[PDB]
Ligand binder design. Structure first.
Ligand code: BR
Ligand code: BR
Ligand code: BR
Ligand code: BR
Ligand code: BR
Ligand code: BR
Ligand code: BR
Ligand code: BR
Ligand code: BR
Ligand code: BR
Ligand code: BR
Length: 95
């Protein structure tokens, strides 16, 4: 898979070239990660990056016992339905 890094200073997981990313906001004393925006430029489409970015964010949340708000339409409309094994990470009140 493509190398994804965690850029805390920009609240994002991103490709190493910074061009594709998923941004988040932390809430509730660091217990909830709101995935607010996934961005893949058109020239980087077709590489699975949106999904790889989501996996990186979900793995981070899972490892840290953080729940997720899937605010981003990619996360909610595409990633989660296609990857339902990640659904338990979603804050229960979201769904
Ligand atoms: Br890349
Ligand atoms: Br890259
Ligand atoms: Br934050
Ligand atoms: Br917080
Ligand atoms: Br709480
Ligand atoms: Br935090
Ligand atoms: Br793609
Ligand atoms: Br993509
Ligand atoms: Br996906
Ligand atoms: Br799955
Ligand atoms: Br399902």
């Amino acid at each position: 898979p493509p190398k994804i890094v965690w850029n805390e200073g920009k609240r994002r997981f991103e490709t190493e070239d910074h061009e594709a990313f998923i941004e988040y906001k932390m809430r509730n004393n660091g217990k909830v990660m709101d995935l607010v925006h996934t961005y893949v430029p058109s020239f980087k489409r077709g590489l699975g990056l949106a999904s790889h970015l989501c996996v990186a964010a979900f793995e981070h949340a899972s490892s840290h016992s953080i729940s997720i708000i899937p605010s981003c339409s990619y996360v909610s409309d595409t990633f989660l339905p296609r990857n339902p094994s990640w659904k338990p990470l979603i804050h229960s009140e979201v769904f």
